[PDB]
Amino acid sequence: PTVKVFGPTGTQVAELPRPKVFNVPLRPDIINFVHTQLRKCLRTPYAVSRYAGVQCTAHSWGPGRAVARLPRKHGGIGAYANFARGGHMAHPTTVIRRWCRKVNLNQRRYAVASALAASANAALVEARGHRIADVPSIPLVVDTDNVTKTKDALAIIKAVGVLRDVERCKDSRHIRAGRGKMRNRRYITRKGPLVIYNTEDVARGFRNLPGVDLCHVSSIRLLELAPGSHPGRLILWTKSAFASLDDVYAAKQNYTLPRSCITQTDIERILQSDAVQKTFVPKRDPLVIERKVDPFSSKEALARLDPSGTVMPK
Amino acid sequence: GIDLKTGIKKRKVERKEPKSPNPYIRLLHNAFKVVYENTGEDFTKVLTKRLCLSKTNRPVLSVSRLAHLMHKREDKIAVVASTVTNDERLVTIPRMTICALKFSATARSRIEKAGGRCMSFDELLAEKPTGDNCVLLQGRRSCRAVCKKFGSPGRPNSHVKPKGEHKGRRGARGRHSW
Amino acid sequence: PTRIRKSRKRRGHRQMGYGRVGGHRKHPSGRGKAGGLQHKRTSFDKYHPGYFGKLGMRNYHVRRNIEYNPTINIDKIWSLIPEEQRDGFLQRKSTTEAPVVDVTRFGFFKVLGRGSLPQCPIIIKARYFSSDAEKKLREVGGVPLLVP
């Protein structure tokens, strides 16, 4: 099959073959494992000071003075314990915590490919959160070729149907709920489209827009493809980006994309087919269970066991 | 009160479902579990239990072991719920049909170049769900190095090696060495 | 992650699995490996035969690249020939154009004899041979050779 390509104005203009990276199986378990390890590698260490609580002079008074045995400053003030005001922590935090995590190169490439394949579904992009109800194709390729004024770049995103997703992002900016607003994280906005470009200047006209991000096709970032560790981002490909995907995967030395497999849609079809159904054979009829009750109560209840009636009813 | 202790033992725990997060394993196990309940065949019952095992209970199978086991019955489908690797010490491979969970890239290339077929368990499910003209096979569950140190080296009937490095002599030169 | 650990399931239990009679104290057996011949003797003899004592000659400085000695069996020899060429060599069991395999180029010194070879003449050059590696090679029509 071929993807469609649209002008910077909205009509159909060209067709390109599907890159083979979209046929990789969908693995929300592998995308979650990689997203977790690589988002831990951006952390800045923190720790308390190594002298904190231990700059004072304090020793135990011992028994015989009607007081508890912790170390005390000259004068008798509690010190040097985690349960004393002003003492050290029981186990102080240290910067030698292992902050980063390792991931193999094979599993890093699987996560990018599985996250890119999720982006080719109009049902997973919708369920990720985006507004794509007025979009020509969800594998959305568009010919722009140079964009410098934000005013022109806003005109394309309208000219196609991604206008409601950026206003979704624009009207959502707010002050966050907790302590985070003292620590340089005061505002929050939702995330919109991702424009992926190869050989054309677009970054100047797209960057200022709320909820927009920029990726040169040779280096695609998994934290951008799966915000929140959820796979299906909406992606606006430039034409030259979309037409170099296979060249990029040919540039990875001794690498082959993983093997395509079937889905639960495909398994549910087979079982309802004459090659599998013709092997079916019914179960025996199942036991029949009543409650206990006294046969001697009535004529009819007793007759169920013995019909003749030699047995007295009561 | 009721006495339910004498003559009665403690119940047992076994894997009744795979614990893998791979969606392809859940789909296949759930499918073969269905076929068993509508067939009662003991081939689909052993195969449903193999798909719950824990990857140390699913050792690999090489092509040369299959070529050896399938000899004289070469018209049958080998069924393996594990990975099929390659054996480069065998120079020529015969033609055979193998159905496995996974093939190595080099084992697939060799199997096909002889005229053979590499099936998947969903190809098996569609064409032969109850195992007609199929044989179930597995590798050596006790081939791991870890399972070679189980026990008490040092006891006179052990035949097991110790774990670390031991540079001495005491107890290591046979009986009457302590 | 701290939030899935067994130790957080013991909040409210007075003693975090260490018992009331015994308790959790500092070092009730001593530190490290001490006691192996006296009060841990039942442990050391059951699992560590040959931990105590001396055995054999000592060398004050071992030369790691003298004692290095890689090996290859005869059943692995034909996999050193690239696949594109193996078929043709088997096809024409030549005495006058037999394949030559120099195993030091691949980084082996001695050739051992586990396995078997295909019915095809071949020449193997190495630095040392075992006695049944030579025997199985001459059984096939092959020759062994020594190389610098």
Partner: peptide, 30 residues
Amino acid sequence: GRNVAFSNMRRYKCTNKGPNLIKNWFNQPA
């Protein structure tokens, strides 16, 4: 009966005093 291999790790030196024997790699990207 515990069957483990004896650890061959050396005890830490100079942890709270002496010369600093911990080298970090936070400056590696810089």
